[PDB]
Amino acid sequence: SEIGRTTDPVRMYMREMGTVELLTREGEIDIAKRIEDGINQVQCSVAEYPEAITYLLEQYDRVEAEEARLSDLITGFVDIDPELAREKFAELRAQYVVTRDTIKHATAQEEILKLSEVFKQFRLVPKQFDYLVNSMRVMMDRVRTQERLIMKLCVEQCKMPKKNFITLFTGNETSDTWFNAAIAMNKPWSEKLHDVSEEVHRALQKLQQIEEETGLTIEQVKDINRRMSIGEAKARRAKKEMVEANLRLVISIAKKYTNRGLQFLDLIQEGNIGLMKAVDKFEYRRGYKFSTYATWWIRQAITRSIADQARTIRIPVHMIETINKLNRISRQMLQEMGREPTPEELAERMLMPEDKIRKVLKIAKEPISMETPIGDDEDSHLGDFIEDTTLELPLDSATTESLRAATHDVLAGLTAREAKVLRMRFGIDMNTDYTLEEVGKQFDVTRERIRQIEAKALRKLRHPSRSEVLRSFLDD
Amino acid sequence: EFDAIKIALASPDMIRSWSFGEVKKPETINYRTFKPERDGLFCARIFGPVKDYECLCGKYKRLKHRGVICEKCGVEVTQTKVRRERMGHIELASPTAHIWFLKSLPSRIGLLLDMPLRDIERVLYFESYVVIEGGMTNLERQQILTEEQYLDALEEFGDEFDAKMGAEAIQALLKSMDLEQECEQLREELNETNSETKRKKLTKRIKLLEAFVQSGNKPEWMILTVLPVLPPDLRPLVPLDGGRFATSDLNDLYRRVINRNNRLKRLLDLAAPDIIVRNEKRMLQEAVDALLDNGRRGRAITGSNKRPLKSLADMIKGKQGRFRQNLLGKRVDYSGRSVITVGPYLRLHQCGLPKKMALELFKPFIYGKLELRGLATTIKAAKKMVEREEAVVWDILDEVIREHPVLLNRAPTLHRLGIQAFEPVLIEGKAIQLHPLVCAAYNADFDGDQMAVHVPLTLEAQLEARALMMSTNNILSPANGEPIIVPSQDVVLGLYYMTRDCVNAKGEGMVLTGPKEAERLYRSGLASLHARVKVRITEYEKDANGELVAKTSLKDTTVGRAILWMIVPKGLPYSIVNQALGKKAISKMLNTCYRILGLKPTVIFADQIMYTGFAYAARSGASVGIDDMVIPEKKHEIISEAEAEVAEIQEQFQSGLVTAGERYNKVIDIWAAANDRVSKAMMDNLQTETVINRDGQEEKQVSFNSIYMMADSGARGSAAQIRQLAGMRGLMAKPDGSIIETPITANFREGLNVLQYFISTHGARKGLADTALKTANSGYLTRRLVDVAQDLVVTEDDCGTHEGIMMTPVIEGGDVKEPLRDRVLGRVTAEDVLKPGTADILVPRNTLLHEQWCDLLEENSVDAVKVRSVVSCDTDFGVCAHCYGRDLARGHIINKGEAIGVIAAQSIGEPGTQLTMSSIQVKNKGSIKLSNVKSVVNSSGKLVITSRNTELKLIDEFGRTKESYKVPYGAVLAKGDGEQVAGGETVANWDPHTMPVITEVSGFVRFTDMIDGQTITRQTDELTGLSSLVVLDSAERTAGGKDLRPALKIVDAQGNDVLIPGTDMPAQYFLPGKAIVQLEDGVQISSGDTLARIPQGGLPRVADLFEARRPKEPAILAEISGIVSFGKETKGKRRLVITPVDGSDPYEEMIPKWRQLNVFEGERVERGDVISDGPEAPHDILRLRGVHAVTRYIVNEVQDVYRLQGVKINDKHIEVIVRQMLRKATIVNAGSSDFLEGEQVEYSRVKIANRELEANGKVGATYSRDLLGITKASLATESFISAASFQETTRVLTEAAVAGKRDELRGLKENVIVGRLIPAGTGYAYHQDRMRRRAA
Amino acid sequence: HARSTGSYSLVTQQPLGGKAQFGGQRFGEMEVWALEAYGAAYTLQEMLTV
DNA sequence: GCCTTGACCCTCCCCTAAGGGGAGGGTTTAGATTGTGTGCAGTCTGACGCGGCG
RNA sequence: GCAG
DNA sequence: CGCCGCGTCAGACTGCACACAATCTAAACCCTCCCCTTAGGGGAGGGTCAAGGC
Ligand SMILES: [Mg+2]
Ligand SMILES: [Mg+2]
Ligand SMILES: [Zn+2]
Ligand SMILES: [Zn+2]
C-alpha cells in the first residue's frame, strides 16, 4: 500500500495504529469479560493443584490471629465484610476435607472440578493469585526441564528416535519398565543409552516425590499446566485487543503534553505503558466507560515521565511540583499586578519562606548547549569560550618544582635524623605523612622525642642561615 | 611510539573491553549538590573521580592510598584526567543498524546482502519481513514478505521456514552468510558474463567480500548491540558563571538513547502488545541514528532551540570538525597580533616588535634570565618584577631577543612567503614595524592590516627561522624564480626620478672625476640631478675564473646615475643604471645582482636601493596637483565629431537602412574609436609636454609630469587609469554585461554628472562583488590542490629515467607567447641537445640549464629541448631531484626532502584571486612549412591539402619556428610548400561558413546510388543561372536511399573506373545530407575543386581543468588507427566503425547525429585524430594520445588562463599536480599477479609489483593509467587520515572501517595530525632514520 | 595583543580564542602549509604539540 | 646534648529525649474525551553517482 | 554588524 | 541499455564586537532516611609541656 514512502517513525506509528477500529460501550464489556474469563479459567485450573487452596486456607488461618487483614487476600465475591468470608472459607474447607480422603479412578475425578467451581467464587487479589500461578509454574517447570533432560540424557549417548521414545515414557513414571523395552529395540543407539541407566535413576525417581507431593501425577498436572497456559494466553490476547483499540486515547492525551521536554513519541510510549496498566486494573462491573479510568492512568504515566526524563539535570517530582506551582502562582500575580512579581511578594502569595522561593527560582533553568552560536554568528559557539579551570598554570608548576628543589637544599642542610623526621612528618619524597607515633616506631623512640627533634629542626630552618631561599616562596 | 594507525569495525566484545562500566541511567548530575549520579552519563565510578585523588563520598582524600576503589562508592582514587579517557557502554535492548554502514552510499549492508536499500529499510522499520532461511520451501533467502504474505505462508509452511523483521533480521542475515562461498560464487558468475557494468557491480561486491575476509571484520558487526559512551570530560556539563550550566549536545543524544533503551526493556518485561514494542524499537533505532549522525535519515532532531543537535559525526566532520578546526590548525601560545606600520629605517632581516608585546611573548625567557643573572631569587619574584616593569627587565629583554627571530604572518597565507622570520628590534609603539621591501610578499599595505607574531621556542625552531625562513633567504619567488623582495611605489619613483635626464639642467656637460664628485655637486646645488654629464666610472667585470677585473672610462651619464652608481655592487656593468629605471629595470637589476654575485651582496644592494629611493623620492617632492591631469584640448572636438557621427547613424536608422542591431554595433564602434582617439591625444599631450630650450632652440623631451612619471615608472597606475583621469572614462557595461551605447564622455578631473556616475557604479559594484565572492572560490581550489599534492616530496637524487617532455616555445597563431628560454630555464635535459648542424652536442644529457646554458641555446637556434619532468619520473613515492629541476626560490637544483607538492599547490592557487569570476595572414618573413603534409594541385596551380590535421608553420632562416596556424581540410593555399614569403602574404584561403568535398583525382562525375528524387531535391535559382541539387537530410525523404546512402564516383569519359594513386580500391565520395550539389553528371573536374558544399575561461576554467571535468560537448576521437565506415544511421544515435589494417576491425560508436561529423569515409585515421570537433576531454587525451599529451594539454590550458592576467607561474607546478592526478591505474590483464581485472589500483603499487615479477622472469600485469581530478584523487589516497581530513569524512571513514585499512602515516597531513615531524624538510632526516632502524 | 601562556580550552586543550580571554592566535591550515613549504618541520611540530 | 615520662590538651566524631522538618521515593485517582499540528519552511547552485524505468 |  | 529523478557533497583566511532563550500545568496520601533540636559527656587519635634522668 503506502509501505516504503516514509521513514518518519511517527507517521509509521499512526498509520499502523489506525488499522484497529475503536470499541463501543458494549465492546469494552465483552473484552473485559474475556479477560476475566481467562483469569478465572487459570484460577479453576490451578484449583486442581490442592496445595494452592491449602496455602490460601492457611493464609486465612493467618488472618485468624491478625497476621493480615481480609482486604489483602480477597477483594470480593461473585457467584467488604468479614461476615460472609467465614462461611466462604468454610465452603472451601468442607470441599477440601471431602476431597482429601477419596483416592478413587473415575470416582476421584469429579471431586476436583467441584473443588474448582466452588473456588471460582473467590475474587482473589493479584498478589495471592500471582503467587499461586508462578508457584505451580516453577514447580512443573523444574520437573519439566527434568523431563527434558531425561530426553536429552539420550542425546549424550546417541541420536535417537523420539517418536518411538514418547510412546514409552508416559504413564508408568514410577519404574523403568518403559525403559526395559528400549533394550528390546536394540538398534545401536539403545546400546549406549542403557549404560547411563544408573545416572538417570536419581532423576527419573526424584519427580516421584512430586508424584505424591501434590497428590496428583505429572500427566494430570501436565494437562493442568497446559490449560493454565491456554487460560493465561487467552487473557493476554484479550488485554492486547483492548490496549490496541484505545491507542488514540493515548494520543489525544499526549498531544496536550507536547513541548514540555519530551518528543511526541516518547510521550505516547509512556502513555501506552500507562494504558496497559489501565487495562490491567479495569473493572467493567463498576459500570463505567474505559475512557474515564484509562485517562487517569495515561495522564499519570505521561506526567511522571515528563517529571523524570525531560530535564538534563534531573529534579525530583516534589521539586517539579513546587516549580510548577510557583510558575502558576507567578503567572497569576503577573496578570493581577501587571508586572513580574518579585520573589518577596511571591513569598506571600505562596506560603513558603522567601529564600526557599529564591532557590526554587535558581533551580529551574535548563543547561545551555555548548554549541549555541553566540550572537547567531554560527562561526563562534559557546563552548570555545569555556576555559579549563582545573589545570595549574605552568608558572605554578615551575614554582612547585623550584620549591621542591629549595626544600631539598634546606633539608640537606640538616642532619640525616632531622631530615628523616621532617621527610616523614610531612609527606616529602614519600607517598604519605606519618604521625609522631609512626615516626617514633620507625626509630624505636617514644613520640615526644620525635616531637622535640621536629621542633628543633624547625627552629634551625627558621634561622637566617637557611631560610632566605624559602621565605621567597611566601607572597607579600 | 607507533608506526601506523589501523581502523576497523568494533566487535561488541571489543566495545565491552573499552568500557569501564555500563551506563544504566540518564542521570547526569544531582541538582542540589552537583556531584555526578550513580550509573549516569557522568558517573564517578564508571568514568573515574571528579577530583584529583579523591573518592566521591570523601572517605579517601589523599594520594596516600591511590588506585584503591572505595568500597562505600566504587570510585577509584586517581587523577581526574581519566574522565577524558574512560569510556562506558550502553547495552542496547534490541540491535540497531549502524547508520554509517546502512545509509552512506553505497550502503555496505545493502552491498553485502545484495539487497537494495529500500528493501532493507522496509525490513528494519518493521514494514516487511525477510526469510532469513527457507529450508525445503519455495522461499529463497533475501525474499522480503509483506505482512499478509508472511501471515498466510505461516500456515502453508508451518514453522519450517524462518522469517523476521527489524534489525534482528538484518543481523541474522549478516551473520548467516558465508563470505568465501559468496565471493567464489561471485567469481564464477563473473567469469560467465561480459556485461560491463554488471561485471563492475560484481567486482565492487567481490572487493567488499574479500575486504571483509582479509580484515577481521564480521559482517554482523555493522549492527550495534552495544553502544560506546564517550568519556564525560569530552561532553562536559560545566557550570557557567551565572549559576547556569552549559552542556554538550551529546548528553542530550545519549540521554535519549538511554531513555528509549530502558523503556524498551520495560516493554519487553511487561510483554506489551507488539505494536508498542515495534514502535519503541523504531524509536531506539532513530535515537541511535541521531546520536551517531544526526539528520542523515530523514529529519534532524533539534533540541530546545529548534536548531539541530550536534551528533558524534558532526564533531569530526566539516569545516568545524576536529580534523580541520583542531587537528590541521590550532590556536598557539607565544603569539601576538598588532597593526603593521612601515619603519623604513630597517634592514631586510629585521622587524620592529613593540616592547609591550615582546615583554609578553618572551615571558619564560625573561624569567629564566632574571633568575640566571641573580636579579630574582624565585620565579615568583621574577613574575612580580616583570609585572612592575622594573628598569632591569628591559635590559634583560634586550638580552633575550638578541639573536632570537620571530615569525610574522599575515592572513590569508596564500603562499609560503606569508610567514617570514625577522630579527626583532624593540620599538616603543604598539604597531609592528614591517620593512617595506617584504610587503609585496605579504601582500601588505598599511591601511589597517594586522600581522600575527609567533616565537620559535626551541633551538631547532630558532635555526629554522634563521636558516629557512629569514627574510634575507626568501628574496626569490618559489613560483617563477623572479625576485619577490623588490622595490615598489616610492622606491621606484625615487630611483626613476634620480636616473632621468633633463635637457638644459643645471650643471650640464661638465666632466666629473667620479660618482663622489657628482654627489658633491648635487648636494652643493651646483648640478641638477638630471644634468647630462661626463663622469669617469670604474666598473668591475667577473673574469672567467671568478675574480673581478677593473676598467675605467668616461661614460656619458647624468649626475643622478653617477650618484646611484655608488651603491651598485662591484661585479655589475655600468649599463645597468645608465638608463631611466622603472620597476622592471630595478627588478632586473636585482635579479642580475643575484645571478652574478649571489645572495649576500643582493641583500645589501636591496636595502641600499630602498634607502636611496626613499631619500631621493623625498628630495623631488613629487606631488600630485590638479594641473597634472592635463586634458587634451582636442577632446571636445573629438567628442563633438563622434556625436555628429552617432546622430548620423541614428537618422540613418530613421531611414530604415540599418537594423537596430547594426545601428547599435556601429554606434559602439564609433564611440570606441573616439575613446581611443581621446586617449591617444591625451597621452601624446602628456608624455612629452615638456618642450624646453637648449642654446635657445626648443626641443621636446619626455615629460616631468607627476602623473606621467608615476605611470611611466611603474610606481603606481597605468595608462588605463591616466585615461580616466585625463581622457574620457569610456564605455561602461550594464550589470548583465551588455555595454551602454553612450559612453561616459567625462573624466575624473571634470565631473561625472549624476547619471554617468550611476552608470559607473553599475560596474564598480560588479567588480567589488566579484572580488568578494571569488576569494572563496580560489581558496577552495587552493585547498584541493594542497590536499592532492601534500605528500609529494623530493626523495631521491636521480631516478635514471630517460623520458621527458619536449619543451617548445608556445606560439598561438602568429606570435610567441612564451619563448623557449622561459620554459627550459632551470630544468634538466633528458637527451643531448645538439646544434641544428647535427652530431655536435651543444648541451650534454643531464645538465641543469641555468642562465648560461640558456644563453648558449639562444646563441644557436634550437627550437625544442627534451627536458626532464615530474610526470615522467621513475621514482615511486616521491620524485627525484633531477626530474624536478631547479629550486625556484634558491636558484640551484632542489634539495632532497623539499615538499614540492605544497609549493606547487600554493604557487598555482595564490594568483587565483587575480583571475575572473577567415584566411591565414603571415606576419613576417620565413620559409613556409607544413605538417601532416598530404597535398594535391588544383585546377589553377595552387596547393590543396588532403588532410584534416595539417598545420602551417613558419620556419625562420635560423631553423626555429616563429608562427603556426591550423588549416581546414582542403583549404586552397596560394603559396606552396617550402617557399619564402613576407609580411601580409596570405597563403591559405577558405571560407568558414561552408565545407567542401575535395576532389580525389581528376575525372568525371558519376552517381553511385545517388538516385534522382530518392537522395536529392533538384533546385533552380537565377543568380548564377544553373540547376543544382541538394542531398536529402534524415526527416525529409522516403524509405530506401535514406538507408542506402548516396555516393558519387569518379569515371572518365571512356566509362572506366579511375583510381586514386597507390590504391586501386574504388574511390567514392559518400555524401551525407544537407549538402549542396551544383555540379552535373559528366562534368570534367580537376583534382582540387569543390564537388559539394555543406554549411555549418578564468578561475572556473582552472578549477574544471584540475578537476578533469568532462566538457559538455566532447570532441570525439579516433580510438584505433583505421578506415571509417558507417552502421545504422537515422536511429537518433548513429553507429560508426573503424577498420584497422592489421587489427581486429569492428569497433563501434554511439555518435548522436545532431553534431556535425568532421571526417570522411574513405580516408584513414589514427589514435587521437578528431573524428568530430569540440573541446577535448582530458580522459580521452590520456587514453588515446598518452601521458605526456595530457600533461602538455593541462599545462597549456592552465597557462592560457594565467597568461591573460599577466601571471608568471612555472610549469613545474602544474606538472606536479598533473603527476598527482595520474596516480591510479586500471588493470586490464591481471598477469601473474594478485590484482584483479578492471579494478583500480595505486600506480606505484602495480609498478613495483611488475618490477618484482619481471625480476623473477614471470609476466606482469598490464594497466591503463587513469586521470582523476584533484578531488577524486585526494579522496583516493592510500591513507584514510589524509582523505578523511580533506572532505567527505563519512565516506572515507566507513569505507576504511569496513575494509580495515591501515594508515602508515607517510604524507604530511597524517604527520601534522598526530603531532609528528613532517617527512619533508628538516624532518626528512628523522623519518629516514626511522625507516632505517625499523625495517632492519 | 600578546600571550605567552594562558587559559586553555576545555574539551580540546588548546589556547582560548580572543584577546578578551587572553587569546592565542590561530595557526590556521594555511600557515601550516606555509611551514610545510619551507622545510620547517621543527617549528611546525612545536606549533602543533607544545 | 639524647632520651623518657606522666600529665595535660586539642580536634573531631558520635551520643543524649522525643519527636520536627524536610527530601526523595512509591501509590492511586472510576461521568466521559479515541489520528501531531507550527497561522513551520518551503527559497542554493553545480557536479556526481546511482537506481528505477521505459 | 565590521576590519584587511 | 540510455535517461531522468533524487540524494549527497562541497562552497577562503585571520581578526575585533555582540552575547542564551524567551510558551507549555496535579494532588493526596504514605514510606524511609537524614539531619536537627539541649548542654555538654565520652573517647579515639594525635600533639604538647615541663620535669627528670642518661
Ligand atoms: Mg590592507
Ligand atoms: Mg556578522
Ligand atoms: Zn567513597
Ligand atoms: Zn626522476
For residue B965, the domain's CATH number is: 2.40.50.100
Question: Which nucleotides of strand D come closer than 7 angstroms to any CB of the protein?
Answer: 2-7, 23-26, 28-37, 41, 47-52
Q: Where are the beta strands (DSSP E) in B804-919?
A: 805-807, 810-812, 815-818, 833-834, 841-843, 865-867, 879-880
B907 to chain C: nearest residue by CA?
C37
Distance CA A135, CA A386 (A): 60
Do residue A469 and residue B377 have CB atoms under 8 angstroms apart?
A: yes
Burial of A465 (0-12, 13-18, 19+ CB in 10 A): exposed
For the domain bounded by A7-66+80-309, which CATH number is listed? 1.10.601.10
CB B581 within 8 Å of CB B495: yes
Neighbours of chain B (3+ CB pairs under 8 A): A, C
User: How is residue B323 annotated by DSSP?
Assistant: I
Contact state of A383 with C10 under an 8 Å Cβ cutoff: yes
Decide if A310-390 and A391-472 have a common fold.
Answer: yes
In whole angstroms, give the CA distance from residue B434 to residue B442: 10
| Contact across the interface for B244 and A368, Cβ inside 8 Å | yes
3 state DSSP class of B280: helix
Q: B1134, B1113, B1116, B1133: which is closest to B1125 by C-alpha?
A: B1134
Q: Which residues of B are annotated as a binding site for Zn(2+)?
A: 55, 57, 70, 73, 799, 873, 880, 883
Q: Do strands B350-354 and C25-27 pair parallel, antiparallel, or not at all (unpaired)?
A: unpaired
Angle between helix axes A82-100 and A111-119 (nearest 10 degrees) is 170
Helices (H), B811-850: 820-824
- Nearest by CB to A314, from B31, B286, B301: name it: B31
In the block, cell 504474505 appears at: B149
Q: Give residue B984's domain range.
A: 919-994
Using the structure, give the distance in angstroms from the CA atom of A448 to the C1' atom of D2, rounded to a whole number.
12
Contact C49, B353 (CB under 8 A): no
Are B64 and B77 in contact, with CB atoms under 8 Å apart?
Answer: no
Quick check: B445 CB within 7 A of strand E?
Answer: yes
CA distances from A119 to A56, A90, A132, B108, B573 (A): 11, 11, 13, 62, 129
Assign A448 to helix, strand or coil.
Answer: helix
> What are the cell numbers at B1039?
524509405
Does CATH place domain A310-390 in 1.10.10.10? yes
B1123 sits in which H/E element: strand B1123-1126
Q: How far apart are CA B746 and CA B724, in angstroms?
A: 8
Which of these CATH numbers, 3.40.50.410, 3.30.420.130, 1.10.10.10, 2.40.50.100, describes A391-472? 1.10.10.10
Any idea what the Cα angle at residue B1236 is, between residues B1233 and B1240, rounded to 5°? Answer: 110
A300 touches strand D (CB under 7 A): yes
Find cell 632531622 and name the residue.
Answer: A418
- Helical (H) or strand (E) element with B338: strand B335-341
- Where residue B687 sits, what CATH number does that domain have? 1.10.132.30
CA separation, residue B666 to residues B578, B650, B658 (Å): 48, 10, 10
- Quickly give B406 CA vs F11 C1' distance in Å: 35
The residues in B 855-914 lying below 8 A from C, measured between CB atoms, are 897-899, 902-903, 905-906
CA-to-C1' span, B186 to D53 (A): 26
- B1322 and chain C in contact, CB less than 8 A: yes
Kindly state the cell numbers that stand for B823: 620554459
Angle at B339 between CA B398 and CA A373, to 5 degrees: 120
Show me where the domains of chain A are located. Answer: 7-66+80-309, 310-390, 391-472
Q: What is the DSSP string of B952-1021?
A: EEEE-TTS-EEEEEEPPTTPEESS-TT-EE-TT-B-EE--TTEEEEE-SSSEEEEEES--TTTSEEEEE-
Could you please report the per-residue DSSP string of B207-231? HHHHHHHHSS--GGGGEEEEEEE--
Q: Do A369 and B255 touch (CB under 8 A)?
A: no
Read off the C-alpha cell for A129: 493469585
Rounded to 5 degrees, φ, ψ at A304 are -65, -40
Residues 394-433 (B) near nucleic chain E, CB < 7 A: 411-412
Nucleotide nearest to B1150 (CA to C1'): F2
In three-state secondary structure terms, B1189 is: helix
C-alpha to C-alpha distance for B718 and B582, rounded to whole angstroms: 13
- Distance in Å from F42's C1' to A423's CA comes to 35
What letter would DSSP give residue B325? I
CA gap A21, B712 in Å, rounded = 93
Query: Is residue A141 less than 8 Å (CB to CB) from chain C?
Result: no
CA distance B298 to B345: 64
State which amino acid sits at residue B388: R
| Amino acid, single-letter form, for residue B163 | A
Could you give the CA distance from residue B1128 to residue B1148 in angstroms, rounded to a whole number?
Answer: 11
Identify which ligand lies nearest to the alpha carbon of B49.
Answer: 3
What are the angstrom distances between the C-alpha of B1316 and each of B38, B896, B900, B1119, C12?
A: 40, 20, 19, 49, 18
- The technique is cryo-EM
Which backbone phi and psi does B302 adopt, to 5 degrees? Answer: -100, 140
Residues 6+ apart with CB under 8 A from B394: B355
| Closest Cβ–Cβ partner in A386, A393, A395 for C10 | A386
β partners of residue B164: B130
CB spacing of A384 vs C9 below 8 angstroms: yes
In degrees and rounded to multiples of 5, residue B702 shows phi and psi of -65, 150
Cβ pair A395, B384 in contact under 8 A: no
